[PDB]
Design a protein around this ligand. Structure first.
Ligand SMILES: CCCCCCCCCCCCCCCCCC(=O)OC[C@H](COP(=O)([O-])OCC(O)COP(=O)([O-])OC[C@@H](COC(=O)CCCCCCCCCCCCCCCCC)OC(=O)CCCCCCCCCCCCCCCCC)OC(=O)CCCCCCCCCCCCCCCCC
Ligand SMILES: CCCCCCCCCCCCCCCCCC(=O)OC[C@H](COP(=O)([O-])OCC[N+](C)(C)C)OC(=O)CCCCCCCCCCCCCCCCC
Ligand SMILES: CCCCCCCCCCCCCCCCCC(=O)OC[C@H](COP(=O)([O-])OCC[N+](C)(C)C)OC(=O)CCCCCCCCCCCCCCCCC
Ligand SMILES: CCCCCCCCCCCCCCCCCC(=O)OC[C@H](COP(=O)(O)OCCN)OC(=O)CCCCCCCCCCCCCCCCC
Ligand SMILES: CCCCCCCCCCCCCCCCCC(=O)OC[C@H](COP(=O)(O)OCCN)OC(=O)CCCCCCCCCCCCCCCCC
Ligand SMILES: CCCCCCCCCCCCCCCCCC(=O)OC[C@H](COP(=O)(O)OCCN)OC(=O)CCCCCCCCCCCCCCCCC
Ligand SMILES: CCCCCCCCCCCCCCCCCC(=O)OC[C@H](COP(=O)(O)OCCN)OC(=O)CCCCCCCCCCCCCCCCC
Ligand code: HEC
Ligand code: HEM
Ligand code: HEM
Ligand code: HEM
Ligand code: HEM
Ligand code: FES
Lengths: 380, 240, 77, 164, 52, 60, 380, 54
């Protein structure tokens, strides 16, 4: 006889990746969020599959199909609100994944970090076109805003925005192609997540101490299986309390009107996870400067592993950078609130100071403070 | 009856693999449809913007677009109103719903003449044979009012009055308007309506044929070059 | 990479008990509240003051926006 | 080697040519279609515009505001200087016909459509980030970077205006 | 930083200048051929014919 | 006198960058040449039937 | 300095799978069909992505959307005919793939063969729902006929049919759900094809001799790279000569009519592979018997690895079973023609004889031929 | 087209056929569809109550 679990090829791949994987024994609840992200992707795939099962992509019938899903379809309202709140909580777990990466020194995995940055770009684009899909008032106007944002590029921008529009404005061709793009992109996200996990398994997993965990490891089963199952159930408590008790604190009421090109909303915002980038682009008073600010601000994630100027991996022994990191998180909250609020005094100067402090901290203050801590602990 | 008569293979000017359509015949068939076939049949998918660049010039196609009238609106009172059509509009429907067609044409619905060539077996051959094959019924079978015998129509009884004859319309280029010429013109115009990509598709096919006839010997040359290490390889066995 | 060999360990003795023979919540409150309070003491001064500044300038921004909404009596004639 | 690499060069020229054509096929397929290029020319605005009022229509897929202007509005637009705004422009160089002004109602900060008959300058008031515009679309009070674009129109006989 | 600042790396770079410039020329001509760049393709005499 | 494949290999086909350069230049010129030739073959086959063949009696 | 191709993990996987794969040097032109199937899958994915970028799934607008693709979308006629003829080419290469396995004894790789059978079922479902998608007369009536075939199952048939229909007929819910399933299912096909290639790569490929190919083995590059390039070129030749000269010789004329539920076509004909399935269906004159006949006719491919009783793997050296195999291909062709023909004399008795001969020649006659060959070669 | 007593499957009848006639008959302003006015207004039922009683 033989061991089927480690001799059958699919079984031995599953065993070597998920069952007998040598994992660090001391990883906290912040390490559950990768599996939370994967289960978010699976849940959104299933719920959106049902939504596209009962959804038609036409500007005359997009809102009608959304109403048909909400009322006529058995539990179609539950599927739709599950999809929306799952996307929002997917972005919550994405932000916590990224926060764990910056805090516990996980950016030293260069290829894994770059694949994560590409995944982040893919999921924001996917959810942008998904928010475009129901053809609401704010949905259509946010589509116009982000397409003009891409059109800010000189000598290429107008042709590129006419190519993305499929015409000269957001219309039926734009909505249909955005339906196709929003359908296809989560499977590209899944393939890039397979690449993500392959790179991670090649380079091993990180611990909160930032040290070599090779001295003490435990198998992924049953410890982290039951731990991530507990995480999945807490996940589902939060997701369904959002779905069944407070469905509309994360959405926008202006999304519940038919898309009127003639009427403009008086306060236009993207959904809450675009708010910091929207705030920094509103802070910089130039179209080209604003769009470069947005792209470079997301790209500081990929540019970050070259900024590691400390001989200590995680921040868990580096309290000055802990203070700077929590100031960074505070500044991200400020940027979210500034993107929420419109353009009056003093929101302009608050957002400008917030963006300037954000860039200066994440490029300048962390490496200098790391050098300061090295001189403080007498590394050289 | 249960029998059917297969239409023959007419030698069309576009029957060849690289032979395009005769656009003079296409515009003549457009005139045939406009003052012959547009009274009953519709075309929901062919427009004057499709007519530009194939049938007529832009100005002539525009002028024949204002020669019809199109419902549009709403006006300031929220009411539909007549406006002269333009190049963006489609061909005008004779009836608003198919039940009006059933009421007017004795329970027979004329199908859309926008995919009829791609929809009937034989295509333009079927259209030509159906239009030129009107004859008296054989002795013994009887057809009621509004029904006429036709060998190529399945069921042999079509609800269609004989639509074309000699000098039914007047052409513009001085071509004699005999019934066979009118049938040929409307057949090739229906072929263009059912496949506007004919000439472009055949030009694409000619380009594809030339490049693949150039690339297959060259790619085969690369394959035989890379495989010549193995295909001329020699073996020897030298046991002690 | 594989679980058989990852690192070199010498002279290290590990003692472990059975889950069906030891409790699942051993002193969950008496030894649990002091532990979480100690962790809060260790990591309360590096986390809270930035969010205090968030709340302060949140209220300040709301107050300035509402004051810009409010008019002034600079228009007597 | 020259003969073998010549065969390789000619066949990779053919392959690159074919790939360029098929990728251009895909890219042109994702571009604008014949119908949306056909409705790129707007319909006739006629003479249904009221006195001192504005109408918003779908021209080139976008909101186009055609507004009637008065003699006092024309005098104010003439009195407004060229270089006094954010960019050098004049009403006479902007609109040929002073009775009717046709513009593309897209603001120059986030691309919103301004609400007509509003603002402190008598023009439009785009409230997405608070930009006021005059009768010619000049930016006087607001965060908009540029001015409102005026579409290139044509005037036939007095009831016929061709805008596209 | 200071790893790639020396005479050996300088002479390696100088050896690779013609190859890098040639590859940049290949990229430029491939870009203009793929995108049909009018501003560059209204100067070569033969390809001027198709644009008219 | 060197043979023209030897000259082609010595000048262009030896270095890979020059190989790619002559591939791209030949791609542009060959695309032009075959576009001209293929369309010319098409209108010679279909003389008197195409829209630009019959066009001259309707513009003017 | 190190080898990046053999060191970098993604590059290591690509090197061990497609670059430095030890492949038998004597595999015929019939082994290019796996790469042809993969290339046709990629072509179908891209082409359908563009079609759904310009396609709306609604019973009022499905036919109008397909017509708009063919007429007003730039080269959308080329896209649509490329998709249809690429599905036909996919089935041609798929049947040649299956025939290669049958003739060369590749079904001894049991896991790879069963994954292939699941792939074949998935491709049947994908193509059926995709043919439903343009909402023609043939689409609607083939959908109703095959769903009544599903309804032939006792005591659950009506419930499963009303569940699949989303109602009590083929209607808007059926069309939208078939759009969703038809879009998503080729990605499951791609994942199952990755599993297919993994199960094959465990044990290596097979040679036409059926012998151990470890004697004379060559790398997959550049030999089979350029061989598959030539095969891709020839497949493109056949595919687009179909597309650009005979785009409708494999389609149906009356499919180009709008789907009228009240009107019915004189004849019912799906595509030619479903004509094979339809002939096996209608050979046996009862509903449940015909359904079990169709299902069993597909599952005998998976059953055949247990039917191999010969001591020789390939049919290269067994001439009687070659005659049996070509008789099998002969009445594949005959059953396809009968499925094309309407059910009257003598097509009824010809189809019945063809189906019983097909089942007999696969079940009972090939093992007898193999054991007779073993007896004649003094192997028994 | 004809008249018919509406069954259960029919929706609530629109008082105006197209929104521009509604705009003309209601002195410019368009009465919005109150099928999502609660989910479409900041406040919802509180806003509706205050708007009617204010
Ligand atoms: C006939 C006259 C010429 C002759 O006798 O040639 C001998 C030659 C056989 O020579 P050999 O020395 O006995 O065998 C070595 C092969 O030549 C070694 O080459 P090969 O034939 O084994 O190459 C593998 C195969 C690879 O082919 C494929 O991969 C095709 C895959 C199937 C087709 C595509 C799928 C769809 C099918 C729809 C039906 O390529 C071919 O069969 C050659 C294609 C040539 C295309 C036209 C070139 C001009 O015959 C051929 O090569 C036949 C094809 C060309 C004629
Ligand atoms: C399929 C047919 C082509 C297969 C690839 C091939 O032959 O490559 C030739 C060769 C590799 O195959 P090779 O083995 O013939 O390489 C020999 C190269 N020389 C002659 C220099 C020794 O590819 C290249 O040299 C580069 C090809 C790309 C050129 C740059 C892009 C041009 C378009 C830009 C937009
Ligand atoms: C790559 C960057 C350069 C692209 C470019 O200019 O392509 C020129 C070609 C042709 O250039 P063109 O000179 O015909 O004009 C394009 C620029 N407009 C229309 C704004 C004046 O453009 C494209 O292929 C568009 C690429 C869009 C991405
Ligand atoms: C969040 C609220 C505070 C949570 C908390 O308890 O933080 C303190 C905690 C301390 O953990 P640690 O330093 O490891 O101490 C262990 C020592 N025995 O510290 C941590 O848990 C550190 C990790 C926190 C991760 C979540 C907080 C950041 C979330 C937003 C990140 C956004 C990044 C950019 C995204 C857009 C691009
Ligand atoms: C078409 C005719 C192809 C042909 O010529 O086949 C004969 C050829 C003989 O090859 P072989 O005997 O292996 O020897 C090669 C040289 N000694 O035989 C071969 O090359 C073997 C071909 C095997 C695959 C044939 C597939 C034909 C189509 C089958 C469709 C249905 C498959 C089952 C579906 C259920
Ligand atoms: C497999 C699909 C079977 C099927 O066709 O199910 C449809 C059926 C519809 O049921 P319903 O919507 O109530 O309609 C009235 C008729 N029963 O649906 C049903 O009857 C409901 C089937 C529920 C299956 C539940 C499976 C539970 C698995 C738990 C694992 C832990
Ligand atoms: C015994 C034959 C002797 C022939 C001698 C020929 C000369 C030999 C000396 C010179 C060498 C010439 C070259 C030799 C090539 C290879 C050898 C060869 O061709 O052998 C003959 C071949 C194989 O012989 P073997 O398999 O032993 O035959 C058993 C009979 N079943 O067998 C054949 O070719 C015969 C094949 C007959 C097939 C008949 C099939 C009839 C039924 C078809 C039904 C198809 C489905 C129809 C639909 C059914 C339902 C309606
Ligand atoms: C009103 C008298 C019509 C005139 C003028 C034309 N068509 Fe006719 N068409 C008409 C009817 C009432 C019907 C249905 C009759 C029936 O028995 O079903 C049709 C149908 C066709 C068809 C389809 C035939 C088939 O086998 O499906 C064709 C090909 C057709 N009509 C052609 C046609 C042409 C080309 C015409 C212009 C010369 C034309 N018809 C005029 C009504 C009328
Ligand atoms: C979008 C979908 C994503 C999925 C499905 C995913 C999946 C995973 C999983 C399962 C883990 C293991 C759990 C863990 O180590 O904590 C992980 C870890 C990791 N992720 Fe992600 N991730 C995604 C996005 C990202 C992003 C956006 C980033 C960074 C910007 C990123 C960077 C990392 C890194 C560096 C690790 C290693 C952390 C460690 O080893 O401790 N990933 N990812
Ligand atoms: C296979 C995967 C998916 C499919 C088929 C899918 C499908 C759909 C469909 C049909 C809609 C329209 C219904 C509606 O707007 O309520 C939608 C909306 C949406 N989708 Fe997805 N989706 C998928 C995955 C995702 C992912 C991965 C994300 C986020 C990263 C996402 C985010 C959204 C959002 C935010 C909306 C807007 C819902 C709202 O605002 O009410 N979806 N999706
Ligand atoms: C539907 C999509 C399919 C894809 C994408 C696919 C893919 C492939 C590829 C790439 C190969 C390697 C090429 C070769 O060995 O010739 C292969 C081989 C193979 N396929 Fe498939 N296949 C599919 C369907 C099938 C089916 C329907 C069957 C059987 C009923 C099957 C059974 C096999 C077997 C047994 C091999 C091994 C061939 C050998 O050992 O020489 N596959 N497949
Ligand atoms: C990601 C992959 C795919 C997508 C997004 C897709 C999408 C579509 C769409 C939107 C249509 C309707 C457009 C039209 O018929 O005009 C269609 C039709 C069709 N598809 Fe697909 N498809 C995919 C893969 C496949 C595959 C793998 C097959 C077969 C093996 C297939 C077979 C068909 C067929 C036969 C039709 C009908 C063509 C006709 O009726 O002439 N498709 N597909
Ligand atoms: S978009 Fe008009 S004020 Fe900002």
């Amino acid at each position: 006889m033989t061991n089927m679990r480690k001799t059958h090829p699919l079984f031995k791949i599953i065993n070597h990746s998920f069952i007998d994987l040598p994992a660090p024994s001391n990883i906290s609840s912040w390490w559950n969020f990768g599996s939370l992200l994967g289960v978010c992707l699976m849940v959104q795939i299933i719920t959106g599959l049902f939504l596209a099962m009962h959804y038609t992509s036409d500007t005359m019938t997009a809102f009608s199909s959304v109403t048909h899903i909400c009322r006529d379809v058995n539990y179609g309202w539950l599927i739709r609100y599950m999809h929306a709140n799952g996307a929002s909580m997917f972005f919550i777990c994405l932000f916590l994944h990224v926060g764990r990466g910056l805090y516990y020194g996980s950016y030293t995995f260069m290829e894994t970090w770059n694949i994560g940055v590409l995944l982040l770009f893919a999921v924001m684009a996917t959810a942008f076109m998904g928010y475009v899909l129901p053809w609401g008032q704010m949905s259509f106007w946010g589509a116009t805003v982000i397409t003009n944002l891409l059109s800010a590029i000189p000598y290429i921008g107008t042709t590129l925005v006419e190519w993305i529009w499929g015409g000269f404005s957001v219309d039926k061709a734009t909505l249909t192609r955005f339906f196709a793009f929003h359908f296809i992109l989560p499977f590209i996200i899944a393939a890039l997540a397979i690449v993500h996990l392959l790179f991670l398994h090649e380079t091993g997993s990180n611990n909160p101490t930032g040290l070599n965990s090779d001295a003490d490891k435990i198998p992924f089963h049953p410890y982290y299986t039951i731990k991530d199952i507990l995480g999945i159930l807490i996940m589902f408590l939060i997701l369904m309390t959002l779905v069944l008790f407070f469905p509309d604190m994360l959405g926008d009421p202006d999304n519940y009107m038919p898309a009127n090109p003639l009427n403009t909303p008086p306060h236009i915002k993207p959904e809450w996870y675009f708010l910091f980038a929207y705030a920094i682009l509103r802070s910089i008073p130039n179209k080209l400067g604003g769009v470069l600010a947005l792209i470079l601000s997301i790209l500081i994630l990929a540019l970050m592993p070259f900024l590691h100027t400390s001989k200590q991996r995680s921040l868990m022994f580096r309290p000055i950078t802990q203070i700077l990191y929590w100031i960074l998180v505070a500044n991200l909250l400020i940027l979210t609130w500034i993107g929420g609020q419109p353009v009056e005094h003093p929101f302009i100067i608050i957002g400008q100071l917030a963006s300037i402090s954000y860039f200066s901290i994440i490029l300048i203050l962390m490496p200098i403070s790391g050098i300061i801590e090295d001189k403080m602990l007498k590394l050289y | 009856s249960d029998l059917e008569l297969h239409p023959p293979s007419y030698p069309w000017s576009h029957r060849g693999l690289l032979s395009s359509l005769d656009h003079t015949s296409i515009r003549r068939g457009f005139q045939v449809y406009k003052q012959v076939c547009s009274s009953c049949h519709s075309m929901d998918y062919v427009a004057y913007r499709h007519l530009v660049g194939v049938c007529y010039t832009e100005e002539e196609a525009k002028a024949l677009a204002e020669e019809v009238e199109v419902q549009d609106g709403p006006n300031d009172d929220g009411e539909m109103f007549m406006r002269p059509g333009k190049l963006s509009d489609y061909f005008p429907k004779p009836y608003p719903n198919p039940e009006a067609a059933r009421a007017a044409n004795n329970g027979a619905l004329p199908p859309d003449l926008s995919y009829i060539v791609r929809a009937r077996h034989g295509g333009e051959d079927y259209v030509f044979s159906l239009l030129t094959g009107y004859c008296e019924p054989p002795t013994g079978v009887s057809l009621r009012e509004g029904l006429y015998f036709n060998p190529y129509f399945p069921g042999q009884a079509i609800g269609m009055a004989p639509p074309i004859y000699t000098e039914v319309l007047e052409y513009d280029d001085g071509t004699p308007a005999t019934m066979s010429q009118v049938a040929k013109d409307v057949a090739t115009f229906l072929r263009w309506a059912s496949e506007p990509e004919h000439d472009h598709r055949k030009r694409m096919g000619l380009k594809m044929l030339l490049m693949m006839g150039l690339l297959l010997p060259l790619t085969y040359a690369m394959k035989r070059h890379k495989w010549s290490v193995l295909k001329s390889r020699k073996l020897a066995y030298r046991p002690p | 990479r594989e679980f058989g060999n990852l690192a070199r360990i010498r002279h290290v003795i590990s003692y472990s008990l059975s889950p069906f023979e030891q409790r699942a919540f051993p002193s969950y409150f008496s030894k649990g509240i002091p532990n979480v309070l100690r962790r809060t003491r260790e990591r309360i001064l590096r986390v809270a003051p930035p969010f205090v500044v968030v709340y302060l300038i949140y209220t300040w921004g709301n107050q300035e926006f509402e004051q810009s909404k409010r008019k002034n009596p600079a228009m007597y004639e | 080697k020259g003969f073998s690499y010549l065969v390789t060069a000619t066949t990779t020229v053919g392959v690159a040519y074919a790939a360029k054509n098929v990728v251009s096929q895909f890219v042109s397929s994702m571009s604008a279609s014949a119908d949306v290029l056909a409705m790129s020319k707007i319909e006739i605005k006629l003479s249904d515009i009221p006195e001192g009022k504005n109408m918003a229509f779908k021209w080139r897929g976008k909101p186009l505001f055609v507004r009637h202007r008065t003699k006092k509005e024309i005098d104010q637009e003439a009195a407004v200087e060229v270089s006094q705004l954010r960019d050098p422009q004049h009403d006479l160089d902007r609109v040929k016909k002073p009775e009717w002004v046709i513009l593309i109602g897209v603001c120059t900060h986030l691309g919103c459509v301004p609400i007509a008959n509003a603002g402190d300058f008598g023009g439009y008031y785009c409230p997405c980030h608070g930009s006021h515009y005059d009768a010619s679309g000049r930016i006087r009070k607001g965060p908009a970077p540029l001015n409102l674009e005026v579409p290139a129109y044509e005037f036939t006989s007095d009831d016929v205006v061709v805008v596209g | 930083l200071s790893r790639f600042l020396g005479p050996r790396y300088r002479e390696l770079a100088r050896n690779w200048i013609p190859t890098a410039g040639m590859w940049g020329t290949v990229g430029a001509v491939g870009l203009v051929w793929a995108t049909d760049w009018r501003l560059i393709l209204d100067w070569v005499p033969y390809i001027n014919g198709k644009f008219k | 006198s060197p043979t023209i494949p030897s000259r082609l290999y010595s000048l262009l086909f030896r270095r890979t960058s020059t190989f790619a350069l002559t591939i791209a230049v030949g791609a542009l010129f060959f695309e032009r040449a075959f576009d001209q030739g293929a369309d010319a073959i098409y209108e010679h086959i279909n003389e008197g039937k195409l829209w630009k063949h019959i066009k001259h009696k309707y513009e003017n």
